[PDB]
Design a protein around this ligand. Structure first.
Ligand SMILES: Nc1ncnc2c(CN3C[C@H](O)[C@H](O)[C@H]3CO)c[nH]c12
Ligand SMILES: Nc1ncnc2c(CN3C[C@H](O)[C@H](O)[C@H]3CO)c[nH]c12
Ligand SMILES: [Ca+2]
Ligand SMILES: [Ca+2]
Ligand code: NI
Ligand code: NI
Ligand code: NI
Ligand code: NI
Ligand code: NI
Ligand code: NI
Ligand code: NI
Ligand code: NI
Lengths: 325, 325
C-alpha cells in the first residue's frame, strides 16, 4: 500500500543533469524499479551518453544489486541541434575516475554488444508494451522517442503508460534558447524537435506532468550547495553527483544569472516524491514554425504543469540518495 | 648525493594543468621541498585559484605530512586577459567533492587569513631571497611576478635562483593564441604580459629552462590515458588529477586537434626528472608590439629550450605520483 516500487523508464539525452536524474531513480529501488534507459543524440554525443549510462548501471549493480536493464541508443535526429560545447559533457564523464573502476568497465564491456543491437525508439515501445504493470516514462531529453512510439503504436502504447514526467518547455516565464534566429521564448528540449513535442504534449491519451522552466528555475546549481558533497566524498554516488554539479557551478556567473539548473534531477525527484510540487492543468500551443518563436510552449488541458517546487525537499532527497553508495 | 630535495616555489595561474603540476611537485617530498605558491589572476579568477591551492596543500599535509607553506595572491594585472570561459576552471575545482573534505576545508579556513595578507610578488621575492639554499622557481603562468622581482631587487634576487623552469612560448612551432587581432604565432602565457616575458627570458643573470609548445605538443590530454585513473580511484590524488584531466579530454575534438595539453605538468615533471627532455640553448626576441604577432617568441642564448620530451617517462611519473595518497 506504499511498499511497492513504480516501474520506470528513463528517456534521456546524456547531459550532466540527465545522469543526476538517473542516479536519483536508480539509487532508490524501494520506490523505483528502473527497467530501461534510452539515450538520444541531443545534449550529448550518443556513444558517450550510452557508455555513461551503462557504467552507472554497472556500478550501482555492483554496490547495491539493482538489476541490470536494457539500454538503447535512439536514432532520432535533431531539427535544431544543441550547441556543440554542451554536448561534450558525457565525454568528460566517460573519462572520470569514478566511471572507470576496472570491474565496472569490464561488466559494461560484456553487456555492451547486446545493448548496441537495440534501437532506442523500438526499445521504449517494447518495454512499455510488454511490462506487467503500467510504466512511468521519465523524459529528460527531447520528445522524439515518445512521439515515435505514439505514431507507430497508438493506444497499444499509450494505454500502458502510467504517466509521462517530462522536462521541457516554458509557460509563463522566458525560455533558454538564445540564438540569432530565436526570441528567447523557447526551452531547448522542445526546440530540438518541436513537432515531436507538439505530438506528445497534446496527445489526449497520456497523462503528462511537465517540469518547465517555471518550476526548474527554483533549483539553480550553486557552489554553496555543491560543496556539501565533500562531507560525503566516501560515497561513489556523491563523487558522481558532486562532480557532475561542480562542472556547472560557474555558469550562473558566466551567463549573468542564466544558470545551469537541476532541470532533469527535479523532474526525476517528482517520481520519487510526488508532493514535491503542485500541478496545474494547462492547454499549450507548441510553436512548430521556423520563426523566432520556434519551440515556444505558450498557453493556448494538455499537461499538468509543475508549480512551486520544494527546494528543501529536493535538497534532502539528493543528499540522501547520494549516501546510498 | 641524491637524497636531498630541491627547494621549489610554484608561481602558477590556477588552470587545471597548474594544479596537476602542483600535485606532482608536492606529492614528491623526497625530490621537492615546496616552500611556497604564488597564484596570478591570469588563467583563473585569483580567489578560486588561491582557495584550490590552499585546499590541495591542506589535503596533502593531512595525508602525507608535507609541510604547510605560504601562499600569495599576486596583484599582477593582465595586458591581454585570458578568455573568460577558461578562467572558470578553478571555480569548478573549488566545488569538487575531493576538494571539500570537511577537515581540509577547516584547516584552510584557519590558514587563509595569514595567507590573504601576502602580496604574491613580494612573497616570491622574500621566499627566494631568504631561503637557505638556492631556489628553483617553477613558473606555469605569466612571467609578471618574476619580472617584478627582477626589476625591484636585481642581483639580490637573481643570485638566489637556482633555475627558473617556465611554461611558455612557441619557438619553431605555431602558437595557441587565436583571436581576430592575432596571427596564431604566440603562446598564451607570454601573450598575457609580453613585456614581463621579455624582461625575464633574456635576463642574462638567471638560468631559464623553457617548456614551449615545441615540447608540450608531445603531451595532449586524451581519453585513453585519462581513463587509467579509474584503476587508482581509491587514491585522492588520482581522483584529483583524473578529474582535472577528464574535464579537458574533449578539447582536442572540439578544436580539431588543438588539444588541452599537459603543459604545466610536463614543466613540473622536469624538476622531478631532469632527463625527461634535452635542452637547446636559444636566443629569443620577444614581440612586445601591439600588432598581430604580439607575444611571439621567435628566434633572434636567452633560454634552454626543452626538446624531445619523453611521453613514457611523463606518464609513468604522473601515475606513480597520483598513487602517493
Ligand atoms: N547550459 C546548458 N548546458 C547544457 N545543456 C543545457 C540545456 C538543455 N538541457 C539540459 C538539461 O539536461 C535539460 O534536460 C535541458 C534544459 O533546457 C539547456 N541549457 C543547458
Ligand atoms: N584550452 C585552454 N584552456 C585553458 N587554458 C589554456 C591556455 C593557457 N595555459 C594553460 C596552461 O595552464 C598553460 O600554463 C598555458 C598554455 O598556453 C592555453 N590554452 C588553454
Ligand atoms: Ca536532458
Ligand atoms: Ca598555467
Ligand atoms: Ni505498499
Ligand atoms: Ni550481477
Ligand atoms: Ni534486448
Ligand atoms: Ni544541506
Ligand atoms: Ni643525496
Ligand atoms: Ni599539521
Ligand atoms: Ni607570511
Ligand atoms: Ni599507463
Amino acid at each position: 500500500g506504499s511498499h511497492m516500487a513504480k516501474t520506470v523508464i528513463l528517456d534521456h539525452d546524456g547531459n550532466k543533469d540527465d545522469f543526476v536524474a538517473m542516479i536519483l531513480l536508480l539509487s532508490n529501488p524501494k520506490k523505483v524499479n528502473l527497467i530501461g534507459c534510452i539515450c538520444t543524440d541531443a545534449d550529448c554525443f550518443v556513444e558517450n551518453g550510452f557508455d555513461v549510462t551503462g557504467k552507472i548501471m554497472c556500478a550501482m549493480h555492483r554496490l547495491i544489486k539493482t538489476p541490470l536493464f536494457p539500454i538503447g541508443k535512439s536514432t532520432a535526429t535533431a531539427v535544431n541541434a544543441f550547441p556543440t560545447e554542451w554536448r561534450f559533457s558525457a565525454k568528460n564523464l566517460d573519462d572520470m575516475p569514478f566511471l572507470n573502476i576496472v570491474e565496472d568497465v569490464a561488466l559494461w564491456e560484456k553487456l555492451k554488444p547486446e545493448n548496441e543491437a537495440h534501437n532506442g525508439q523500438q526499445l521504449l515501445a517494447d518495454l512499455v508494451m510488454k511490462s506487467k504493470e503500467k510504466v512511468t516514462v521519465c523524459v529528460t531529453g527531447p520528445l522524439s522517442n515518445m512521439a515515435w512510439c505514439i505514431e507507430k503504436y497508438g493506444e497499444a502504447f499509450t494505454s500502458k503508460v502510467e504517466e509521462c514526467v517530462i522536462m521541457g518547455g516554458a509557460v509563463d516565464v522566458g525560455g533558454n534558447v538564445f540564438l540569432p534566429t530565436t526570441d528567447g521564448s523557447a526551452e531547448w528540449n522542445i526546440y530540438w524537435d518541436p513537432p515531436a513535442a507538439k505530438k506528445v504534449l497534446c496527445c489526449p491519451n497520456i497523462r503528462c506532468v511537465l517540469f518547465s522552466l517555471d518550476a526548474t528555475n527554483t533549483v539553480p546549481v550553486r557552489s554553496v550547495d555543491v560543496k556539501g558533497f565533500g562531507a560525503q566524498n566516501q560515497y561513489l554516488l556523491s563523487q558522481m553527483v558532486g562532480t557532475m554539479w561542480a562542472m556547472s557551478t560557474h555558469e550562473e556567473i558566466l551567463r549573468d544569472g542564466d544558470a545551469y539548473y537541476a532541470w532533469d534531477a527535479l523532474t526525476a525527484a517528482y517520481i520519487l516524491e510526488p508532493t514535491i510540487a503542485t500541478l496545474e492543468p494547462v492547454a499549450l500551443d507548441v510553436d512548430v514554425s521556423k520563426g523566432k518563436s520556434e519551440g515556444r510552449t505558450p498557453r493556448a488541458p494538455c499537461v499538468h504543469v509543475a508549480r512551486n517546487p520544494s527546494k528543501q525537499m529536493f535538497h534532502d532527497l539528493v543528499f540522501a540518495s547520494t549516501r546510498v553508495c
